[PDB]
């Protein structure tokens, strides 16, 4: 049995750990509290993890892959921990929130954002921290704005939303962090009952049946996630498109956010992890019940069965869609729209603004968020010809 790989190669940043991509497809591996379940790198055995029924994502059924667990059974509302039936009333609501309608209606807000922080770092001028400048704030107003939420408070959020997907922090930080925010979140819900808006919370408050408590774990669930997914995307993607500059040029392709997404691959250790409820044969393998099954997604999304040249970073390739960076089945990602749209807009407009940006230390001096459950550069200082 294996321990889950951990440790990416000095000049690989993007390249999953060596470790993790030795392996065959169906691997044993050892969780921290003993259990001896199985890490799954394929993409086929993981796609049948994602979308088959007899695997559960609830906690009373999952040997954690990481002991220290944020969350509050599953608090009513706390819908990612949830199996269907509970987690398809909480999800339906949601897909009749995040709508076409919705996402249209906030494009232009996320070009004036995105532009509005363009304008500030050419105002600074170079060196900036892209992170700081524009990786960070761009999507966490965007969050903000889709919720109701006030972004005077960003740097509050900010610092408990990290806290909130390490891997690296106690259960008495995270519980604090848990705390701190819904706090915060429940009391923007008391005060969203009396004055109705058409943010995505006010219309759940409007349009639904949901209770307080559940829509400040929704609201909770959606506000982390609002910070600590798309930043990291536009921190780790600029990175990687200062890396293999030649790419820059086929960055208006249909798809090249998909490569991004395939490439990068940042939720990277673990995740998503499922319980058997029955026995499942997969790859050579039988899993039994009770056994917790974790995935590779870097690993699954440099599959050579279905990926051509798979480990290149090709935004004009024509399979980028069998990726998985969003996941699969009835927990895929609920707000891949509105980051597709975040990133198309941030990447094109940060390009189109400074064609001349590099970094302005050696690669290798960038950090990375090995520690986080969602990878990605803790700064990332650039420059360009001002
Ligand atoms: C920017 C890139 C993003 C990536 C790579 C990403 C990735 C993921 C993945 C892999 C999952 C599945 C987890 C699992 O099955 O265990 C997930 C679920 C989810 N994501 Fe995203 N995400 C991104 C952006 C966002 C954004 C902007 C939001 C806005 C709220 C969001 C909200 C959610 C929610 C609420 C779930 C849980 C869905 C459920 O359990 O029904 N994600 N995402
Ligand atoms: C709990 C945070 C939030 C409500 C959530 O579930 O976000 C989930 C679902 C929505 C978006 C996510 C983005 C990044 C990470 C993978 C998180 C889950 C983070 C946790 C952190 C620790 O508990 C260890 C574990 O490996 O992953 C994920």
């Not at 740097?155 to 408990?160: D, P, R, S, V």
């Not at 440099?302 to 290149?312: A, L, N, W, Y």
């Not at 940060?350 to 990605?376: C, D, M, Q």
Request: contains cysteine.
């Amino acid at each position: 049995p294996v321990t889950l790989p951990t440790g990416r190669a000095v000049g690989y940043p993007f390249d999953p750990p060596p470790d993790l991509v030795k392996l065959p497809p169906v691997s044993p591996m050892r969780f921290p509290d003993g259990h001896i379940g199985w890490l799954v790198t394929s993409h086929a055995a993981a796609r049948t993890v994602m979308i088959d029924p007899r695997f559960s994502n609830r906690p009373e059924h999952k040997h954690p892959v990481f002991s220290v667990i944020p969350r509050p059974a599953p608090a009513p509302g706390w819908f990612t921990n949830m199996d269907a039936p509970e987690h398809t009333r909480y999800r339906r609501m949601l897909i009749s929130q995040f709508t076409v309608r919705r996402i249209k209606e906030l494009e232009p807000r996320i070009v004036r954002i995105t532009e509005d922080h363009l304008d500030a770092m050419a105002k600074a001028g170079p060196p900036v921290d892209l992170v700081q400048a524009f990786a960070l704030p761009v999507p966490s107003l965007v969050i903000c704005e889709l919720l109701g939420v006030s972004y005077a408070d960003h740097a509050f959020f900010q610092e408990q939303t990290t806290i909130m997907v390490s891997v690296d922090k106690t259960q008495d930080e995270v519980t604090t962090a848990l705390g701190k925010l819904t706090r915060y979140i429940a009391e923007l819900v008391a005060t969203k009952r009396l004055s109705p808006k058409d943010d995505l919370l006010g219309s759940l408050i409007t349009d639904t049946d949901l209770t307080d408590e559940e829509l400040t774990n929704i609201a909770l669930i959606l506000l982390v996630a609002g910070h600590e997914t798309t930043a990291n995307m536009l921190g780790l993607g600029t990175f990687a498109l200062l890396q293999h500059p030649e790419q820059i040029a086929n960055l208006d392709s249909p798809d090249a956010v998909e490569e991004l997404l395939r490439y990068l691959s940042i939720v990277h250790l673990g995740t998503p992890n499922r319980a058997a409820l029955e026995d499942v044969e997969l790859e050579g393998q039988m899993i039994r019940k009770g056994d917790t099954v974790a995935i590779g997604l870097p690993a699954v999304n440099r599959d050579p069965k279905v990926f051509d040249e798979p480990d290149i970073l090709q935004l004009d390739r024509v399979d980028a869609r069998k990726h998985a960076a969003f996941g699969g089945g009835i927990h895929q990602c609920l707000g891949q729209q509105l980051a597709r749209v975040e990133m198309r807009i941030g990447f094109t407009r940060l390009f189109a603004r400074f064609p001349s940006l590099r970094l302005a230390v050696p690669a290798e001096e960038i950090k990375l968020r090995e520690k986080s459950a969602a990878y990605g550069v803790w700064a990332l200082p650039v420059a360009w010809d001002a």
